[PDB]
Design a binder for these strands. Structure first.
Ligand SMILES: [Mg+2]
Ligand SMILES: [Zn+2]
Ligand SMILES: [Zn+2]
Ligand SMILES: [Zn+2]
Lengths: 36, 262, 97, 81, 112, 142, 171, 538
DNA sequence: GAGAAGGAGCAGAGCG
DNA sequence: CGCTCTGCTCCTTCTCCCATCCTCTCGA
RNA sequence: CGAGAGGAUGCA
């Protein structure tokens, strides 16, 4: 993969277990072979 | 399913076909031992045309006027005309063609005269004509003995089998029966003089060249024919179709049985 | 990538047997096994560090052979033996002449 | 049974390929070279050159269904491919 | 006679869509289905139910059922099938493998 | 039995002294190939020269084997070996039995029967007495 | 005893050895591999008859690599034991439990359980021979032995030589 | 040790004595495990050791080069082999039922003809159809040669029961009825004569009827049934391992019940359970209802399941398999590329490698490639010494230090003119695969000459193909001389050329060769120069 | 839900 | 009339159906 | 690790 961290979400379920979510974003430039 | 049926069929060095158990399938691959890749449609000029027309295009008579050989065709003129000895060679040639004419009428009932056969003779002759710009406007140096003898000698070199026993030799005679019928047709003495005004050097070159071309087209032993046959049928099978499944699976309960009574 | 059944059929058509072997062995599954000459089974103790071999149940210490087969093939036979079938492999054709 | 071998004297495409590959493999392993080098570092090209002028020291054994065979020296065979 | 009829019958199917394939490929197929002295189908109940090498038979449509039959019958495979060699991973005796290449010691010495 | 030449050759019950003679000839021929590239005491020393001039000396056991076999060699004169070969083999004696008599020293027929159980039950002692004395006479000559 | 048997052996040659020298070189390699062999089937391999005119039989080139296999056929002299055999051997070494004797290329232990009951180990002798009976056996002396089967080992082959018999006695 | 190749394969059934002989140990406990050690009676070091434990029955080599070794289970009672239940039925329908002879014999003409059948498979087939109709094995049978004389053949002389299939067991219906005793069947089979084997197609040394009934189970070692550590040191062992544990418990109970007071009935069901488990273990998919389910609820995957069916150990690992030294990606056209050529993405050529050998003809070039290192394209990844030292150029500065030696191998990157193999799935026919010459291009896709799509049946709308790189020198020549594109211009399928001019190129020819088309001098000169074969004559 | 291989059952003509 | 025995028919019992990729998810 | 679902990929 390749990109940068967009937004990190730290939370907890009903059980008190900490949950972490990391969204990473990247730019896809139309390349040779991409479908249209 | 189909490929597995033929997964282990191959041609062995004896030019026969056998499965993994060594059972025979065809005593000669494709009934002629010729590789499919080197076969292209060619005309069989002896089938068509009216008998009178057929006689016109091949018959030669050095004694009478109906089929007199034109002296200008060759450097030898009256030397040939009147020579009964040569007339005998023409007769067997003409008689030989007649046997093919009636023989082929049984091979191809409908009279179709364009079948896949090895070696494009038509192309070979043209190369000779344009090889060194043969002058189509002057008499040639050929002789009927050379033409007839060259043809017979040529037929002796078209070896698809090598065994020296009669059984192998007998197959060798049959394996090229159809082809040699084509050979005599387009190399008939008459046609070698009017339509193809070849010279002696060119004619010898043709005889040598055809042998090399024919031999190359002989099926190579070890060709995994079984797989090739299956695939060659599968691809057109991607385009009737339920019917094909109805044949491969014998399926006695055929969908649309029907007869055809004449 | 999957070199499936359809794939080899084409190689068979071309007749490129040697290359097919490379794909079916050198690419993957390459394995060596020792087999008792008397019994065609992978029942050979291979003390390679001592260069000692033995087939318990045959009392044989001379009839051992290196054989290269796909590792999947070895698994197939081992499951077959678990199934009570005996895939006896022999390196010498019975029909001599 | 060299006396009266029944196989064709011409050389098959498959055996051409096999001979070329094997001889190239030998060359790659510093096997003796029998033809002068014109800079064809390519072992396969070296083998092609060897074959073109019949310097390969190999003999081919053709098998028949019954288990018998015929032995042919690469020199004996005629190459038209 | 049927073999000839089969060829004509199959010939119609192929030629129906306008396609054309060489006479040899059909001829081989029809001949194979009749070499056994009868119209042998190409299903698991035809071609499969042969006397060929058990190992080769294993891969067509039935695997475990054939194995048991062989073991009960003490069947023996000659290893001349292509698939058999594939399973064993040995150079099948075909094409480039349909013969043996041996060193001509005589020529080697004869050449210097 | 059958050799690897496709020839049904019977088992060669090679005798000790004739075995030594054959090995000596083989060593001489081996030295010849390299070039292309009697009392028990004289024989023992002479063979060691051939072994040393034909082998690298790595396998001393064969040198020992020949040396000790020479010590007990019973028919050292190859020409006399031809006689004993004819004496035993011409009688139809089983080769296994022939080698024993032509390799082991024996005086009387009973001794041969005593030493070899296979002879004790079916052999003709009269030939043993005749042959053994003949061989015993030959044995003394060495 | 000793036998002459046509034996076969398979040799593989690295390509570098594919030169004209192979005629004699392969005979040589056969000699190193064959000479001095211990095997239960054929006992001891002593010598190869006809050191020239060896059967090369054409090298078979493997498909994995350029090495070529040769099925070498040769005539060779081998030594074999048999149960209940008599040997006119000699004592190689002494021991309290018996003697070790030479049987051609093979070593045989002459165990005290099988020497004559009246014959007993005499430690006082030098060598410590058995001297309690007329059958005085020592390293320097000769001995006829009675082969009681064969006991082959991976490194070598040996057997048991009994003396407690009416024949095959000392010397 | 000696090297050989397989020449012929012989099949048959184990002798239970042979099974015990082969086994390196006896399985006794269902427990596989005080925390890490294994019970000596199951998955012990005498079987295929677990990683880092170089025992494998003192075979060491970990798992890299050492397979497993079979165990032994001594069954309390004989049980029927599922695969041969029908076959066992058929044979029992022909034997004289406590005599050891066949219901009928050669004295009848029909059996001589049946006994004359060369095919063993057809032999008993004909016999079975005949014997099954016979319901009595009378001792005295009138001779065909002498009708007044009767052959005192049938040892029993009595009648026989009609055998019926009852799930995992057979029931003998006597014409006057009980479940057949598996033990008795062994006695009946043991009475069979070698002469009978020939009639029944059995091999005296490879397959005997009594061996059709399992008295001991060969236990495959862990390599066949790999230990699983999917979760945090969680076992989740394969089904077979759990399945065998059940059989041990079933067998142990059957012995336990017999020993503990012999509660006759309780033994009866336990036998079926043991018969049930063994049947399911070998095959969990039978005609009858019985269906073993894993504790998770999913059906238990029997050995037949592992083997039978597509993606089984035959079609999924032997007829085909995953291969390395290969590539896959999308394709595109390139008119500026010759038929036998192909554009390969520069990155791919930097991943696939070729084991080239160091020789006096290429030592110079290879030396430079090692100097370049795996980072640059024209370089190599691993240098293999004669001893097998696969030096990884990735993790060493030695790329500038190693001195190559003859006989070493270098994992050369793919470069131009390297013969490689393509394939478009599905590989319908031969032309779906040919050999091309590599051409390195700097964009992430394959390139083809426009005209080669006709045979490939390809399409640049996003289709993919598979690239395979040969590894041995022989293979390079083998492809370049048999599968090269030009070698397949004309096909044997229809005696026709496979490729041609298609799409725009074809239209241009029509316009270009049209009668009234004329080209100005300025344009012509450029047009000529494009033809690489032009002789320079205007 | 579709087609092929198995097994059971009615059954009518020929022999005693 | 008595009894046999291959012929033909009426139910069961399975057995097999394009090759690839290429993912995310779910629950043991 | 298996199971499932989605998107397909290819037709005069
Ligand atoms: Mg498309
Ligand atoms: Zn064994
Ligand atoms: Zn181990
Ligand atoms: Zn009975």
């Amino acid at each position: 993969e390749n990109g940068i961290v967009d937004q990190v979400l730290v939370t907890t379920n009903q059980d008190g277990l900490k949950f972490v979510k990391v969204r990473v974003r990247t730019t896809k430039i139309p390349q040779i072979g991409d479908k249209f | 399913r189909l490929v597995k049926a033929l997964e282990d069929i191959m041609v062995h060095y004896d030019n026969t076909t056998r499965n993994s158990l060594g059972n025979v399938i065809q005593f000669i691959y494709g009934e002629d031992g010729m590789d499919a890749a080197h076969i292209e449609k060619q005309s069989l000029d002896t089938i068509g045309g009216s008998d009178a027309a057929f006689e016109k295009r091949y018959r030669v008579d050095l004694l009478n006027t109906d089929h007199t050989l034109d002296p200008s065709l060759l450097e030898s003129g009256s030397e040939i005309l009147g020579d009964l000895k040569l007339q005998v060679l023409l007769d067997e040639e003409y008689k030989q063609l007649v046997k093919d004419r009636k023989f082929l009428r049984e091979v191809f009932v409908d009279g179709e005269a364009n079948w896949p056969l090895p070696v494009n003779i038509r192309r070979i002759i043209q190369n000779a004509q344009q090889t060194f710009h043969i002058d189509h406007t002057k008499p040639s140096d050929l002789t009927i003995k050379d033409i007839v003898l060259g043809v017979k000698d040529l037929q002796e070199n078209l070896l698809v089998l090598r065994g020296k026993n009669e059984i192998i030799q007998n197959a060798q005679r049959d394996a090229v029966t159809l082809f040699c019928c084509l050979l005599r047709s387009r190399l008939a003495t008459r046609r070698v003089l009017q339509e193809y005004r070849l010279t002696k050097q060119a004619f010898d070159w043709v005889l040598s060249n055809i042998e090399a071309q024919f031999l190359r087209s002989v099926v190579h032993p070890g060709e995994m024919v079984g797989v090739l046959a299956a695939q060659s049928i599968g691809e057109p099978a991607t385009q009737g179709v339920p019917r094909l499944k109805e044949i491969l699976n014998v399926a006695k309960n055929m969908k649309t049985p029907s007869l055809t009574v004449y | 990538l999957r070199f499936g059944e359809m794939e080899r059929d084409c190689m068979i058509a071309h007749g490129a047997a040697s290359f097919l072997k490379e794909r079916l062995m050198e690419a993957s599954d390459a394995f060596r096994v020792h087999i008792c000459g008397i019994c065609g089974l992978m029942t050979v103790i291979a003390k390679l560090n001592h260069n000692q071999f033995e087939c318990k149940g045959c009392d044989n210490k001379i009839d051992i052979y290196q054989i290269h087969i796909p590792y999947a093939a070895k698994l197939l036979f081992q499951e077959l033996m678990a199934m009570n079938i005996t895939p006896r492999l022999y390196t010498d054709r019975s029909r001599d002449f | 049974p060299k006396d009266q071998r029944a196989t064709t004297p011409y050389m098959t495409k498959y055996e051409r390929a096999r001979i070329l590959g094997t001889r190239a493999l030998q060359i790659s392993m510093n096997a003796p070279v029998f033809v002068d080098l014109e800079g064809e570092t390519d072992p396969l090209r070296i083998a092609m050159k060897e074959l073109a002028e019949k310097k390969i020291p190999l003999v081919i054994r053709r098998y028949l269904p019954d288990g018998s065979f015929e032995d042919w020296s690469v020199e004996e065979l005629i190459v038209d491919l | 006679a049927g073999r000839a009829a089969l060829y004509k019958e199959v010939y119609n199917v192929i030629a129906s869509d306008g396609s054309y394939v060489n006479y040899r490929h059909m001829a081989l197929l029809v001949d194979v289905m009749t070499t056994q002295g009868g119209l042998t189908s190409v299903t698991r109940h035809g071609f499969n139910r042969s006397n060929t090498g058990a190992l080769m038979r294993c891969s067509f449509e039935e695997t475990v059922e054939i194995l048991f039959e062989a073991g009960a019958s003490a069947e023996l495979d000659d290893c001349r099938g292509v698939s058999e060699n594939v399973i064993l991973g040995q150079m099948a005796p075909i094409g480039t493998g349909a013969f043996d290449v041996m060193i001509d010691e005589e020529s080697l010495v004869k050449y210097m | 039995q059958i050799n690897h030449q496709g020839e049904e050759e019977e088992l060669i019950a090679l005798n000790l002294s004739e075995a030594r003679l054959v090995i000596k000839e083989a060593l001489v021929e081996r030295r010849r190939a390299f070039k292309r590239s009697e009392t028990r005491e004289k024989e023992l020393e002479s063979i060691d020269v051939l072994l040393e001039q034909t082998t690298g000396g790595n396998n001393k056991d064969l040198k020992n084997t020949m040396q000790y076999l020479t010590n007990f060699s019973r028919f050292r004169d190859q020409e006399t070996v031809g006689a004993v070969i004819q004496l035993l083999k011409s009688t139809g004696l089983h080769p296994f039995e022939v080698a024993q008599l032509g390799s082991l020293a024996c005086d009387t027929a009973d001794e041969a029967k005593t030493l070899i159980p296979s002879l004790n039950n079916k052999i003709s002692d009269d030939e043993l007495e005749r042959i053994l004395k003949e061989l015993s006479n030959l044995e003394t000559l060495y | 005893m000793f036998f002459i048997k046509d034996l076969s052996l398979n040799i593989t040659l690295h390509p570098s050895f594919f030169g004209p020298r192979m005629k004699q070189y392969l005979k040589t390699k056969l000699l190193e591999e064959v000479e001095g062999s211990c095997t239960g089937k054929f006992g001891y391999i002593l010598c190869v008859l006809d050191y020239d005119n060896i059967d090369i039989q054409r090298g078979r080139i493997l498909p994995t690599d350029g090495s070529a296999e040769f099925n070498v056929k040769y005539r060779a002299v081998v030594f074999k034991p048999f149960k209940g055999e008599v040997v006119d051997g000699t004592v190689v070494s002494c021991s309290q439990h018996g003697f070790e004797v030479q049987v051609g290329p093979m070593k045989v232990f002459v165990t005290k359980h099988l020497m004559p009951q009246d014959l007993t180990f005499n430690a006082g002798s030098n060598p410590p021979s058995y001297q309690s009976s007329e059958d005085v056996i020592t390293i320097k002396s000769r001995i006829r032995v009675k082969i009681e089967g064969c006991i082959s080992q991976v490194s070598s082959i040996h057997a048991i030589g009994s003396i407690k018999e009416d024949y095959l006695g000392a010397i | 040790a000696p090297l050989r190749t397989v020449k012929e394969v012989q099949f048959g059934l184990f002798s239970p004595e042979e099974v015990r002989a082969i086994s390196v140990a006896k399985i006794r406990f269902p427990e596989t495990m005080q925390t890490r050690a294994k019970i000596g009676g199951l998955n012990d070091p005498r079987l295929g050791s677990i990683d880092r434990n170089l025992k494998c029955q003192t075979c060491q080599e970990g798992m890299n080069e050492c397979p497993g070794h079979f165990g032994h289970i001594d069954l309390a009672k004989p049980v029927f082999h599922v695969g041969f239940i029908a076959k066992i039925k058929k044979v029992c329908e022909c034997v004289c039922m406590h005599c050891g002879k066949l219901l009928l014999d050669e004295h009848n003409e029909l059996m001589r003809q049946a006994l004359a059948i060369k095919d063993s498979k057809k032999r008993f087939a004909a016999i079975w159809t005949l014997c099954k109709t016979k319901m009595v094995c009378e001792t005295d049978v009138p001779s065909e040669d002498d009708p007044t004389q009767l052959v005192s053949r049938g040892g029993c002389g009595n009648t026989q029961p009609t055998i019926r299939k009852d799930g995992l067991k057979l029931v003998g219906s006597w014409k006057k009825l009980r479940v057949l005793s598996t033990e008795e069947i062994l006695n009946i089979f043991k009475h069979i004569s070698v002469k009978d084997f020939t009639s029944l197609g059995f091999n005296e040394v490879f397959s005997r009827p009594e061996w059709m009934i399992l008295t001991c189970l060969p236990v495959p070692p862990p390599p066949v049934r790999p230990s699983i550590s999917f979760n945090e040191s969680q076992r989740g062992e394969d089904d077979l391992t759990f399945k065998l544990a059940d059989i041990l418990k079933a067998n142990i109970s059957l012995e336990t019940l017999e020993h503990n007071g012999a509660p006759h009935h309780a033994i009866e069901e336990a036998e079926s359970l043991l018969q049930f488990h063994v049947a399911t273990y070998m095959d969990n998919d039978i005609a009858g209802q019985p269906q073993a389910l894993q504790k998770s609820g999913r059906p238990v995957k029997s050995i037949r399941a592992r083997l039978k069916g597509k993606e089984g150990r035959i079609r999924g690992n032997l007829m085909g398999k995953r291969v390395d030294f290969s590539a896959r990606t999308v394709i595109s056209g390139d008119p500026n590329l010759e038929l036998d050529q192909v554009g390969v993405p520069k990155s791919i050529a930097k991943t696939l490698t070729y084991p080239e050998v160091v020789t006096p003809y290429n030592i110079d070039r290879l030396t430079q490639l090692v100097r370049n290192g795996p980072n640059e394209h024209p370089g190599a990844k691993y240098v293999i010494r004669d001893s097998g030292d696969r030096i990884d150029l990735r993790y060493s500065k030695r790329a500038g230090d190693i001195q190559l030696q003859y006989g070493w191998k270098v994992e050369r990157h793919i470069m131009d003119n390297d013969p490689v193999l393509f394939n478009r799935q599905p590989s319908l026919h031969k032309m779906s695969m040919m050999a091309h010459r590599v051409k390195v291009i700097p964009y992430s896709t394959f390139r083809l000459n426009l005209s080669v799509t006709s045979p490939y049946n390809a399409d640049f709308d996003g289709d993919e193909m598979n690239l395979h790189v040969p590894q041995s020198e022989e293979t390079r020549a083998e492809l370049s001389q048999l599968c090269a594109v030009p070698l397949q211009i004309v096909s044997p399928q229809s005696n026709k050329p496979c490729m041609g001019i298609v799409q725009d190129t074809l239209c241009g020819i029509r316009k270009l060769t049209l009668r009234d088309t004329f080209i100005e001098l300025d344009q012509v000169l450029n047009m000529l120069y494009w033809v690489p074969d032009w002789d320079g004559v205007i």
